[PDB]
Amino acid sequence: VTAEIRLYITEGEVEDYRVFLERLEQSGLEWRPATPEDADAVIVLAGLWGTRRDEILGAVDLARKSSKPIITVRPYGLENVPPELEAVSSEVVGWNPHCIRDALEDALDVI
Numbered sequence: 001v002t003a004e005i006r007l008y009i010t011e012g013e014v015e016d017y018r019v020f021l022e023r024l025e026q027s028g029l030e031w032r033p034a035t036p037e038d039a040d041a042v043i044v045l046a047g048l049w050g051t052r053r054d055e056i057l058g059a060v061d062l063a064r065k066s067s068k069p070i071i072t073v074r075p076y077g078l079e080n081v082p083p084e085l086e087a088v089s090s091e092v093v094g095w096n097p098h099c100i101r102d103a104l105e106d107a108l109d110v111i
Contacts, residue, residue, distance in 0.1 A: 005032070005108075006034030006038065006039050006040040007034065010044050010048060036063075039069060042059060045073050046072050046081040069090060070089055072091075073092075074094040090106075091106055
């Protein structure tokens with residue numbers, strides 16, 4: 001069967017970005033790298049907020065014209081996300097397998 005979903009992740013340089021890729025792999029669910037213009041789920045890491053905030057900003061603008069599928073993932077625990085994401089954010093999760101699953105099936109049921 002081909003139930004894979006269209007996901008997208010931002011580019012980072014911290015080691016948390018790699019550890020995240022491995023976890024998603026252990027998930028087992030099928031996922032494919034879709035462009036940021038036609039993506040169904042955009043998992044953005046809040047760890048690159050004090051580094052590539054100018055880049056993430058763009059991903060948001062484009063997301064404001066595609067259902068705004070922007071999900072914020074808490075940082076490994078170095079700081080705290082500001083009140084500027086929960087405002088234009090559609091879903092927010094942390095380092096959990098069930099949490100990411102709730103925000104995923106959320107993009108499916110579009111009412």
